[PDB]
Amino acid sequence: AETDVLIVGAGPAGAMSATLLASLGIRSLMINRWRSTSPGPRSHIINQRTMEILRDIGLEESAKSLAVPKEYMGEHVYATSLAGEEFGRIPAWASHPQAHAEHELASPSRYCDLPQLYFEPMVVSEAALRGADVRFLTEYLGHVEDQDGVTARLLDHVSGAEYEVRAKYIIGADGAHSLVAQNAGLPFEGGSINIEFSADLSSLCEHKGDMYWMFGVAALRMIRPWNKWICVWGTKEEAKKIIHEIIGTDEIPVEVGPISTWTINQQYAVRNTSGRVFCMGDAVHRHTPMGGLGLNTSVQDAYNLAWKLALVLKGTAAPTLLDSYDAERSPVAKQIVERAFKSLSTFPPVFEALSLPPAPTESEMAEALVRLKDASEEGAKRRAALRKAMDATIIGLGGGHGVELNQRYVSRAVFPDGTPDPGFVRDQEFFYQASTRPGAHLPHVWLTENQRRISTLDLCGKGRFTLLTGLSGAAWKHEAEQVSQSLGIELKVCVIGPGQEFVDTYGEYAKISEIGESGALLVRPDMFIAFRAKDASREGLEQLNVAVKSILGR
Amino acid sequence: AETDVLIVGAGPAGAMSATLLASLGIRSLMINRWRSTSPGPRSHIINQRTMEILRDIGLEESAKSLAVPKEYMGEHVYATSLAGEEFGRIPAWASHPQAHAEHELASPSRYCDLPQLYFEPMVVSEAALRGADVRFLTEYLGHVEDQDGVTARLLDHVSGAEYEVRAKYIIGADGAHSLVAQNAGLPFEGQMSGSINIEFSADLSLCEHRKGDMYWMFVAALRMIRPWNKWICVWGPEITKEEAKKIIHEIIGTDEIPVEVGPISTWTINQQYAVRNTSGRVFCMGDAVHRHTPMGGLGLNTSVQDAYNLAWKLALVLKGTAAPTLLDSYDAERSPVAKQIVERAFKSLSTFPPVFEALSLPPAPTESEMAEALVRLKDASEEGAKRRAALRKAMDATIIGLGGGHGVELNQRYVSRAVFPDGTPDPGFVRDQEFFYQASTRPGAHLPHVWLTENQRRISTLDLCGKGRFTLLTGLSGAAWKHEAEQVSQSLGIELKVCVIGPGQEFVDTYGEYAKISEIGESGALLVRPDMFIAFRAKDASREGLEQLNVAVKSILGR
Amino acid sequence: AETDVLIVGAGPAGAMSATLLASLGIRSLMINRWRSTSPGPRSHIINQRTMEILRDIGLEESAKSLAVPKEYMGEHVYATSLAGEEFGRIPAWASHPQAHAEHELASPSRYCDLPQLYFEPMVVSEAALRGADVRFLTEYLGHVEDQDGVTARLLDHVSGAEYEVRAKYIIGADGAHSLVAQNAGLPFEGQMSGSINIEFSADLSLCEHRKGDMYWMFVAALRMIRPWNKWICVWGPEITKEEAKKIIHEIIGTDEIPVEVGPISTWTINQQYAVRNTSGRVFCMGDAVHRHTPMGGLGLNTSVQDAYNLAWKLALVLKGTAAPTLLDSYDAERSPVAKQIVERAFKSLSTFPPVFEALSLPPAPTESEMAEALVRLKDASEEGAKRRAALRKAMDATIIGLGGGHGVELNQRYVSRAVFPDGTPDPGFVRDQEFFYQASTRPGAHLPHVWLTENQRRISTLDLCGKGRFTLLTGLSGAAWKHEAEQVSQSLGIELKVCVIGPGQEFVDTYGEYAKISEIGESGALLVRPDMFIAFRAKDASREGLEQLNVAVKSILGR
Numbered sequence A: 001a002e003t004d005v006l007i008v009g010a011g012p013a014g015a016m017s018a019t020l021l022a023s024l025g026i027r028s029l030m031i032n033r034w035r036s037t038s039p040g041p042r043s044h045i046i047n048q049r050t051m052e053i054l055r056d057i058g059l060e061e062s063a064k065s066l067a068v069p070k071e072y073m074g075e076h077v078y079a080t081s082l083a084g085e086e087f088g089r090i091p092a093w094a095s096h097p098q099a100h101a102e103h104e105l106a107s108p109s110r111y112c113d114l115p116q117l118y119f120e121p122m123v124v125s126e127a128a129l130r131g132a133d134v135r136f137l138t139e140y141l142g143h144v145e146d147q148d149g150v151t152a153r154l155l156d157h158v159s160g161a162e163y164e165v166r167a168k169y170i171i172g173a174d175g176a177h178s179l180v181a182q183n184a185g186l187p188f189e190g191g192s193i194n195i196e197f198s199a200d201l202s203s204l205c206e207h208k209g210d211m212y213w214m215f216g217v218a219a220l221r222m223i224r225p226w227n228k229w230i231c232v233w234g235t236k237e238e239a240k241k242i243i244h245e246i247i248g249t250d251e252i253p254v255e256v257g258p259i260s261t262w263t264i265n266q267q268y269a270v271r272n273t274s275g276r277v278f279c280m281g282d283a284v285h286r287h288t289p290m291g292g293l294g295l296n297t298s299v300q301d302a303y304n305l306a307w308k309l310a311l312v313l314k315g316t317a318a319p320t321l322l323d324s325y326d327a328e329r330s331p332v333a334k335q336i337v338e339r340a341f342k343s344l345s346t347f348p349p350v351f352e353a354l355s356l357p358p359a360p361t362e363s364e365m366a367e368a369l370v371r372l373k374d375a376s377e378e379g380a381k382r383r384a385a386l387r388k389a390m391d392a393t394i395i396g397l398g399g400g401h402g403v404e405l406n407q408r409y410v411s412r413a414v415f416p417d418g419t420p421d422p423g424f425v426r427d428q429e430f431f432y433q434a435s436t437r438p439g440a441h442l443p444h445v446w447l448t449e450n451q452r453r454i455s456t457l458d459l460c461g462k463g464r465f466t467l468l469t470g471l472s473g474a475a476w477k478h479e480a481e482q483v484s485q486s487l488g489i490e491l492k493v494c495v496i497g498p499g500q501e502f503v504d505t506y507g508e509y510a511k512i513s514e515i516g517e518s519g520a521l522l523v524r525p526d527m528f529i530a531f532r533a534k535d536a537s538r539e540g541l542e543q544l545n546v547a548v549k550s551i552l553g554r
Numbered sequence B, C: 001a002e003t004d005v006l007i008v009g010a011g012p013a014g015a016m017s018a019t020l021l022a023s024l025g026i027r028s029l030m031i032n033r034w035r036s037t038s039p040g041p042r043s044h045i046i047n048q049r050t051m052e053i054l055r056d057i058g059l060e061e062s063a064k065s066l067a068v069p070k071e072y073m074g075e076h077v078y079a080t081s082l083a084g085e086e087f088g089r090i091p092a093w094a095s096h097p098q099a100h101a102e103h104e105l106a107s108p109s110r111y112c113d114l115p116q117l118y119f120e121p122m123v124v125s126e127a128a129l130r131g132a133d134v135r136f137l138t139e140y141l142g143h144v145e146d147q148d149g150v151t152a153r154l155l156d157h158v159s160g161a162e163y164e165v166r167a168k169y170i171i172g173a174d175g176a177h178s179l180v181a182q183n184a185g186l187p188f189e190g191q192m193s194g195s196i197n198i199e200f201s202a203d204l205s206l207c208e209h210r211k212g213d214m215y216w217m218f219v220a221a222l223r224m225i226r227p228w229n230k231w232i233c234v235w236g237p238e239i240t241k242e243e244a245k246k247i248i249h250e251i252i253g254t255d256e257i258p259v260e261v262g263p264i265s266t267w268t269i270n271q272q273y274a275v276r277n278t279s280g281r282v283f284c285m286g287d288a289v290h291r292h293t294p295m296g297g298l299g300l301n302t303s304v305q306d307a308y309n310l311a312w313k314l315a316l317v318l319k320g321t322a323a324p325t326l327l328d329s330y331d332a333e334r335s336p337v338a339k340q341i342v343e344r345a346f347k348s349l350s351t352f353p354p355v356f357e358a359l360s361l362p363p364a365p366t367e368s369e370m371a372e373a374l375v376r377l378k379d380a381s382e383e384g385a386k387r388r389a390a391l392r393k394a395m396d397a398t399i400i401g402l403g404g405g406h407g408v409e410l411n412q413r414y415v416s417r418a419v420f421p422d423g424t425p426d427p428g429f430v431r432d433q434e435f436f437y438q439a440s441t442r443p444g445a446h447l448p449h450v451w452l453t454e455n456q457r458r459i460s461t462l463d464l465c466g467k468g469r470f471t472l473l474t475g476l477s478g479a480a481w482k483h484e485a486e487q488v489s490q491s492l493g494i495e496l497k498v499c500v501i502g503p504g505q506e507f508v509d510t511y512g513e514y515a516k517i518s519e520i521g522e523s524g525a526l527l528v529r530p531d532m533f534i535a536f537r538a539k540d541a542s543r544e545g546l547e548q549l550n551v552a553v554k555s556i557l558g559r
C-alpha cells in the first residue's frame, strides 16, 4: 500500500482529519481496529467550535437535524432521584439569558447534544465521500520512520493478513492508550460505570435539563428525549434495580441496555509531534468528562493540522509549518486536562453544605432533607450554602465559555502585528473575549449577503486563506493577488462595505475589527487570524508578502 | 343614572380602568363619544409592563395570540426606499442578544406589536364581561362637584337625549384634548407639528428575510400592521387623494406590487404634561395628562399603567377599607411619569437630524442630492470611511426611541404615602437609568421578576402577586410573617396573601434566583401592592420587623 | 332615533347582520338588553360555512388565532371518568383521515373550536368599526309597523329613559324567546328538558396524549374551553353549591388536581322551528327561528348563515337596486334550514341510549351496576365479544352529532326567486346527504371550493367571490361574458365582477380542478351571489346563453 497520510484511528479526531485532508485533495488512509463506529453515546456535548468546523465543511445542518438543541439542555436538576424532591437547579449549557447572550454573540453556532454514537458515522462517511480511504477491522502494529517517510505494519482482522503501508506522515488519532504516541516517544505530564437503558421518562422531564444528577453521585443523562437513557456514576439484572432507585419509582418499564466502564489516567502530552508523527485527540489529552471538552478539542486538533499538512504535501509550505501544530495545540492539551480535573472539586462542597460525609446512608440523606427545610436562621444559612455550592458546579456544565473559545496561538504560523497582548477584561475561563489580534480566532459578527445574514466565519475557511477589509482598503485586492501568484497560494479577498458582495449591514464588523476600515485581517483555513494590518498604507501593504512567506516557512 | 365611577373615555386608559374596577367589584360607567373603538392602528408597541398587566388580569394569552412577537420586530431598516438600497439596520425592540437578555431578565413578559385597532376591543369587551357598564355614542358635556360626589351631564348620540349621572368619582380618560382635565383646571407644562398616516394593503418578498417592525425612508416610516399584507406609511389638516398611491409607490421604490390605498388620517400633537393629575373627585389619566411624540411607544403603555395605579386605590376607598387620602398617591406616583415620557419622547426626535448631517445632507434633500450622498457613502477613501462611520454612529443613536429605552419603560420609582420607606437610602442606578432597567426591592420599586417553581413548573414572582390584593413574600425562616399578616388582615379588614417561598413549599426558589434578587435575608419580607409595586420591606422576622407591618399597612391605607 | 335596520339582538346572528349591513353601507342600530357579550362559552364548534363567512369579511385569520384547531378536537373519549378507564374513542370532528379528506376538499376553511365568549366580541367590535351603531343595555319592548317602515319602543337600562326608533326594517335576532317573533306572529312547529353547565379551572396530564374537544362520562360531558386549563362540565332551575366541586371531582375521577369552581348556569330548550321567518318588515333569524339541542353544533353556525343570507338582500332593496320581493327569498331559503337543524339536532339524541343498552345498563345505572358492566366488557367469552362489538357499534353511531354530519352542514339547496333555475333536474345525492357533502354547481347550491392560483399562490374559488357583490366565473372561451356582464351591470345599476379563469389570466386553473368541478364547458358561466350561492348557470357562451344573463339578474332582483 501507499498513501500520503496514514491516520490511525477513526474516532472524532481521526475522522475529522480524514475528512479535511480528503477535501484539500490529500490522499489518506484512515484505519480503525474495530468493526464499527463507537457503540456508546460517550461524549455528547458539541460546542460552538466543533459546530463552526461542521459549518465550514457543510455538515452543520445535518448535525443540527440529529442533535438535541440548546434549549432542551438547560434545565439541570440536582435531586435524590428523578421522581423525588430536588435540591435545586442550575442553568446548564449557557441557558441563563445572560449566558445565552454571551453564547449567541460569540459564534454563529450553538451548543447541541449529539452523542458520538451518531457524530462518528456522520464524519466517517463524509471522509470516504470526499476521497479518504477508510478501512476498519485493521490494526496498527508499529512503524519505522526514515526521513523520506514512514512504513507502518498493519494487521487485517478480516483476512488475517499483515501488510505494510508507506506514508509521508502518520496521524496518531488512536485514543487514550495510543500506541502511536508510545512509538513516537511523546512525554506525558500531569473511572466510571455507564448503563444504557430505555424508559419513557417524558412525564418527569417534559415540564428539560440535559442531565439529572442524583446525590455517591449518579448522573441520569438524556440520550434521546426522553426515551433513551444512560446512568453514570463514580453488574447483572441488579442494574435494573439501580435504575429503579435512581428513578425513584419502579413504575416505568425499563429496558436495560449495554453496560460499560470508562477508566481515565489523566495526562497530557507535553509535545504532540515527533518527526513525521503527529498525535491528536485522546492520544495527547486524557481527562474527566467535566465541561465536555474532549471530543470538541480533539476535532479542533484535526482542524489545526490538516490544512498545514496539505500545504506542505503540496510543496506550498516548508515542512516547518508543521512545527506550529505542537506550538498551538499542546498548550490546549494541558489546559483542558487541568480544567476538566479542577471541575471535580466543585462537587464535595455540595455534600458539605448538606453537612454530609462523602458517602451518606439513606438515613443520613433523609436527615439532610429535613435540615434543609428547617425554619431556623441556621436552616437559611444551610439553604444559601447549598445554592452557593450548586452554582459553583456550573464551570463544568456550560459555564466555561472562556475555556471553550479563548484560544491564543503563539507560533511561526501566526505573524505578530507588534501590539501587546491586551489580556482579558473578565475571567478568561468563564468568559469569551473576542480579539482580532493575530493568534486569536476570527470574531463572529453578522454581515449580509443579498440582505440575508452571513457570518464573518462564512466568508472564510474552506481550506484557504482569506483577507478581510473594507472599501478604503481596496488596495488589498491587488496586493493579495501579487502575493498569491508569487507564492502559489490561494488568497481570497473580501471587501466588506455598502454596495459590495458582503455588507456591514449592522455596523458590527467596523465595531469588532479593532482597526480602521482600510486595515486587513488575514484568516487561516482554521479560522485563526494570522496577520493584521492597521491600514492600507504602503508599509502596511508591503508587510503582507512578508507575513505570508513567514507563515509558510519560506 | 348612578354609578361609583364615571370613566370618560374608552381608549386604553379608560378601558383598562373599567376592567380593573369591575374585577374589583366596583360599579362603573364607561362612556365614549364615538360609535366604535379606534379605527386606526395607532399605538402598536406593547411593552413588558402592559403585558404584565394583561398577564395579571388574564388577557396576556389572547394578546399574544393576536400580536406579532418580538422576534419579528427587530429589523429596523434605514433606506432610500423599500426595494432600494439600505443605509443600514438597527437591532430595534431589544433584538440585540445583549438587549434581549436584559429584556428577558426584567419580566416574564415580552415586547409585542399589537395595534390599538385590536387591543382596544379586547379590553372594552373584558370590562363589560367583568361587570362594567359600557356606553358608546355618549358624550361627556360637563360636571359639577359637591362634597359627596359628582354630577355629570351627558349627551346621547343615539337618542338625542341629554341626561345626568351621579358618581362618587370621575376618571378623565378622554384623551389629548381632555375636557375633563379642562374642567378640573389641571395645569399643564412643557408646551415646548403633526404627522399623516396612510393605510394601504400590499403583499410586500422584501420584508421577510429581515422581519422588522418598521422601515424608515430618508423621513417616511413604513410600519407593520400585519406581516406583511397590511401596511401604513407615516411622515412629518392636509388632504391628499390618489397620489397617496403614488406616495406609497416611491416609498416602496417600485410600482409592481398591487396596493390598496386605505384610510388617510392626520395626528397633531401639542406636547404637554399635566403637572397635577387630580382635582377633588376628578382623576385624569392617559393622553389626558401626557401628550407626546410616538418615539419610544410610551403612550399607550404609560396610559394603561396610569389605570393600573389608580383602580385598586379607588376600590379600597369606595369599600371604606382605605381613607380617601390613599388617592393622593395617584398624583404623587404618576405625575412624575407623565412629565418623564413627554420629555423623553421629545428628546428622541433630536436623534434623527445627525443622520442627515452624517450624509452631508440638508433637512430637505432633493433626489439628486440624495443620490449623491449614496455615491459619497461608497467612496473608497479615508474620507469615505469617516462618512460611513459617522452614518453608523448617527443610526445607532436612534435606538433610544426604538427599544433602547428599557430603563425608561421599567424604572418607576414611587415616593408617596402609598409607599412605606424602609429607611435605606436610594441606591440609584449603576448604569444609565434610561437605557437600562435596574431591579430593586426597595419600597417604591416594581417587584422584580425571577422564576420560581410551582409543582416544578416555572412561575414568576409576579404571578404570586397582583389580583387586586396585597401580597407578602418571604422564606421558610420568615414563617412568623404568616400569623402577623393574618392579624393585620383581620384587624384592618384587608386581604393579604402570604407566600412562603422555599423547599417543600407551594412555591419553591428552584433556581435560587429569589434569594439572589430579594436584597434581604430569607426571613425578610416584601409587601407587594395590587399594582405590583413594593410598598414595604422588612430585613428580617425580628419582633421589631414583625410589628412594623401593621404600621406600614395602616399608613398606606391612610388609617 | 332613526335608522335603516333595527337589529334586535347582538348574539352571533345580530352581530353578523350588523357587520355585513355596515360593510354594505347600510345604516343599522344593533341593540342588546344586557351589559356585555355572552359570559359563557356556550356554542363553540365553528363549522366551515361560518369560517368561510369570516374569511369573506376578513376575520378568519383572527378567528383562527384564538380558536383551537381541528387537529386538537378529534379525540372524543367515552369513559367512566377522566382518570378512569375508557370504553373507547371516536374520531370526532372529521378527524378520521377519510373524513378529513372530505372536509378539506369541501372548503378552504376548517373546523375549529371558538367559544362564543370570544366569537361574540370579535364580531360586535367589527360591526361597530364597519359603521354600525351598537347599543347595549337597551331593551326592545315592542313595535308597530305601517306601510313605510317600523317604529320600535326601547328601554334604556342606563338612563331609565324610554325612546322610539324609526326603521325601514327590523331584524329579530333576539334569541330563543324572541319577543320580535312573538310580535310578528311567526308560527312555530315541531314542539315535540334542560342542561346544567359548570365552569371550572384545572390543569388536566390526562387530556394531552389525546387532544380532544370533549370527554363523555357515563351522561356527563367534560368539554374544552382552553387546552387544557379552562373547563366546563355539562349534563342533562337547579341550584348546586360546593358539591359541584365534588361533582367535578368524580367526573375527573380523582381529587388531586386543584380545581377552581367557576360560574354555574342552566340552559333549557323548547325545541321548535318557525315555519315562516318573515312577517311584513320583520325578519327573524338565529335562535329566534330555530331552537334545538346542541348535538352537531349547528346553532351558532346556522344563525350566522341566516344573517349572511339576508344582509346583501336588504342592502340591495334599501339601495333601490332590488325590488322588495327579493326579501321573500329569505324565508324560502332559510326556513327549510331551520326545520332541518331542529329535527337533526333532536334525532342525534336517540343515538346515546343504545350505548347504555349495549352495556346491559338501565338509563340510570348505580356505581355497582356500572362497575359490573365494565367487568362484563372484559369477559373472555364469545358473549363478551358480542358485547364489545355492540358497544363499538353504539359508540360509532354517535358520530352523526359529533362531526359526522358534514352533509347537514354544507348541502344547502335553495329554491326561490333569488335562484334562477337552469332547466336541469335535481341530480340528488349519490351518498347519504346528511353524512356526506356533495358539491354542485347547479343554481341554488353553494359555489364549490377548489384551488386556483393567483401569481402561482393558491386561492379558493370562494376568494374570487363574495365581498357584498355578484361574481361571474368563466374561462378563456367564455370571454364574451365580460361584455355581457358589463351591459347588464350598467343597465341594472348593479356591480358584477367577471373572473376569466385560465392560462395567462389573473386567476389560473393551475390544478385543473375548476374544469373538473364546474360541471360545464369552459365557455359556461356561474353567477355567484354575495352569499356564495350560485344563482345562475349557463352551459356555454352561445347567443342564447349570453342573453339569458340579463333575464336571470332581473329575475333575481325582482325587476
Ligand SMILES: Cc1cc2nc3c(=O)[nH]c(=O)nc-3n(C[C@H](O)[C@@H](O)[C@H](O)COP(=O)(O)OP(=O)(O)OC[C@H]3O[C@@H](n4cnc5c(N)ncnc54)[C@H](O)[C@@H]3O)c2cc1C
Pocket (backbone or CB within 6 Å): A008, A009, A010, A011, A012, A013, A014, A031, A032, A033, A034, A040, A042, A043, A044, A116, A138, A139, A140, A141, A173, A174, A175, A176, A179, A260, A261, A262, A280, A281, A282, A283, A288, A289, A290, A292, A293, A294, A295, A298
Ligand atoms: C468508553 C468511553 C466513554 C467515554 N464517555 C465520555 C462521556 O461520557 N463524556 C465525555 O465528554 N467524553 C467521554 N469519552 C471521551 C470521548 O469519547 C472523547 O475524548 C473522544 O472520543 C476522543 O477522540 P479520539 O477521536 O481522540 O479518541 P477515540 O474516539 O477513542 O478514537 C480512537 C480510535 O482509534 C482506534 N484505535 C486505537 N488503537 C488502534 C490501533 N492500534 N490500530 C487501529 N486503530 C486503533 C480506536 O478503535 C478508535 O477508533 C469516552 C471515551 C471512551 C473510550
Ligand SMILES: Cc1cc2nc3c(=O)[nH]c(=O)nc-3n(C[C@H](O)[C@@H](O)[C@H](O)COP(=O)(O)OP(=O)(O)OC[C@H]3O[C@@H](n4cnc5c(N)ncnc54)[C@H](O)[C@@H]3O)c2cc1C
Pocket (backbone or CB within 6 Å): B008, B009, B010, B011, B012, B013, B014, B031, B032, B033, B034, B040, B041, B042, B043, B044, B116, B138, B139, B140, B141, B173, B174, B175, B176, B179, B265, B266, B267, B285, B286, B287, B288, B293, B294, B295, B297, B298, B299, B300, B303
Ligand atoms: C390618529 C392617531 C394616531 C396615533 N399614532 C400613534 C403611534 O403611531 N404610536 C404611538 O405610540 N401613539 C400613537 N397615538 C396616540 C395613542 O393612541 C395613545 O396615546 C393612547 O390611545 C391614549 O390613550 P387614552 O386611552 O389616554 O386616549 P384615547 O385612546 O384617545 O381615548 C380617549 C377616549 O375618550 C373619548 N372621548 C374624548 N372626549 C370625550 C367626551 N367629551 N365624551 C366621551 N368620550 C370622549 C374618545 O373618543 C376616546 O374613546 C395616535 C393617536 C391618534 C389619534
Ligand SMILES: Cc1cc2nc3c(=O)[nH]c(=O)nc-3n(C[C@H](O)[C@@H](O)[C@H](O)COP(=O)(O)OP(=O)(O)OC[C@H]3O[C@@H](n4cnc5c(N)ncnc54)[C@H](O)[C@@H]3O)c2cc1C
Pocket (backbone or CB within 6 Å): C008, C009, C010, C011, C012, C013, C014, C031, C032, C033, C034, C040, C041, C042, C043, C044, C116, C138, C139, C140, C141, C173, C174, C175, C176, C179, C265, C266, C267, C285, C286, C287, C288, C293, C294, C295, C297, C298, C299, C300, C303
Ligand atoms: C346558557 C347557554 C348555553 C348554550 N350552550 C350551547 C352549546 O353547548 N352548544 C351549542 O351548539 N349551542 C349552545 N347554546 C345556544 C347558542 O348560544 C346559539 O344558539 C346562538 O347563540 C343563538 O344565536 P342568536 O345569535 O340566534 O341568539 P343569542 O346568542 O341568544 O342572541 C340573542 C340576543 O338578543 C338579546 N335580546 C333578547 N331579547 C332582547 C330584547 N327584548 N331587547 C334587546 N335585546 C334582546 C340577547 O341579550 C342577545 O344579545 C347555548 C345557549 C345558552 C343560553
Ligand SMILES: Oc1ccccc1-c1ccccc1
Pocket (backbone or CB within 6 Å): A045, A192, A219, A221, A232, A233, A289, A290, A291, A292, A396, A397
Ligand atoms: O456528560 C457530561 C457532560 C458535561 C459535563 C459532565 C458530564 C459528566 C460527568 C460525569 C459523569 C457523567 C457526565
Ligand SMILES: Oc1ccccc1-c1ccccc1
Pocket (backbone or CB within 6 Å): B045, B195, B221, B223, B234, B235, B294, B295, B296, B297, B401, B402
Ligand atoms: O410607531 C413608532 C414606534 C416607536 C418609535 C417611533 C414610531 C414612529 C414615530 C414617527 C412616525 C411613525 C412611527
Ligand SMILES: Oc1ccccc1-c1ccccc1
Pocket (backbone or CB within 6 Å): C045, C195, C221, C223, C234, C235, C294, C295, C296, C297, C401, C402
Ligand atoms: O357541545 C357539543 C358539541 C357537539 C355535540 C354535542 C355537544 C354537547 C351536547 C350536550 C351536552 C354538552 C355538549
